Amino acid sequence: KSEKFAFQAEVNRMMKLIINSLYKNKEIFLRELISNASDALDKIRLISLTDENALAGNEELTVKIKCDKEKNLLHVTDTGVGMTREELVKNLGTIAKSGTSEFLNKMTEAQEDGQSTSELIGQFGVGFYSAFLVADKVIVTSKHNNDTQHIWESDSNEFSVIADPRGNTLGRGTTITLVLKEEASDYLELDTIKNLVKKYSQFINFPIYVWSSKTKTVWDWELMN
Numbered sequence: 586k587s588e589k590f591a592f593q594a595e596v597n598r599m600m601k602l603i604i605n606s607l608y609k610n611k612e613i614f615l616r617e618l619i620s621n622a623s624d625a626l627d628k629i630r631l632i633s634l635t636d637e638n639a640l641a642g643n644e645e646l647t648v649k650i651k652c653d654k655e656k657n658l659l660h661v662t663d664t665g666v667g668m669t670r671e672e673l674v675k676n677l678g679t680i681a682k683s684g685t686s687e688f689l690n691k692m693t694e695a696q697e698d699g700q701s702t703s704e705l706i707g708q709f710g711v712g713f714y715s716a717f718l719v720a721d722k723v724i725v726t727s728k729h730n731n732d733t734q735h736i737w738e739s740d741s742n743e744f745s746v747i748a749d750p751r752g753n754t755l756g757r758g759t760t761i762t763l764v765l766k767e768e769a770s771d772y773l774e775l776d777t778i779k780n781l782v783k784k785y786s787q788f789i790n791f792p793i794y795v796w797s798s799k800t801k802t803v804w805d806w807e808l809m810n
């Protein structure tokens with residue numbers, strides 16, 4: 586039902602490099618989660634060219650962001666390809682792609698030579714770990730067409746993966762839930778999050794929404810572009 590894992594050594598080192606690189610630009614974490622969601626949406630859209638039923642578990646192709654100020658949570662949900670249990674373990678817990686190894690060598694060279702590094706993080710798609718700049722715990726709930734829904738969770742010191750006891754609630758796709766640091770509570774504010782989401786989202790080929798209020802209060806999904 587449940588299983589605990591240590592991170593691969595190189596992933597611990599990569600996390601520290603990323604955190605050091607972006608320590609004074611922490612808002613880039615949201616750029617990278619949005620970019621990752623965009624990639625996951627691109628992937629299932631490409632898969633849909635080859636598999637007529639690829640979207641049958643969730644017909645939308647969106648990114649949806651919600652702030653839960655009362656629970657201290659930020660959620661970034663996409664209806665992209667999702668991850669199987671094995672992918673949650675390998676993709677987040679190990680150096681899974683050859684590009685990740687290249688990123689590490691290029692990152693170390695740049696950081697010792699004074700070349701800019703945030704572009705490298707974005708280029709190699711390794712920005713997931715920058716979520717630990719703002720979060721004490723990162724939770725990934727994911728549903729892939731080839732597996733049941735699973736939850737990955739980590740405070741950076743280990744991670745675990747469990748089958749989701751709620752069953753298939755996503756249909757298809759992934760939620761990144763951040764348990765924010767006390768110092769990061771501004772990311773629970775709708776005005777902060779709407780501005781950042783609007784930044785960072787002008788290049789995605791999918792609509793991105795924020796759950797927002799008007800105020801008498803009506804809540805709905807606000808398209809950010």
Ligand SMILES: CCNC(=O)[C@H]1O[C@@H](n2cnc3c(N)ncnc32)[C@H](O)[C@@H]1O
Pocket residue numbers: 621622625663665666667668676677685710711712713714759
């Ligand atoms: C460097 C950390 N590794 C990843 O972020 C990998 O995790 C998977 N991943 C990250 N975010 C998502 C997401 N929103 N949907 C699907 N896969 C994801 C992709 O395979 C990424 O390349």
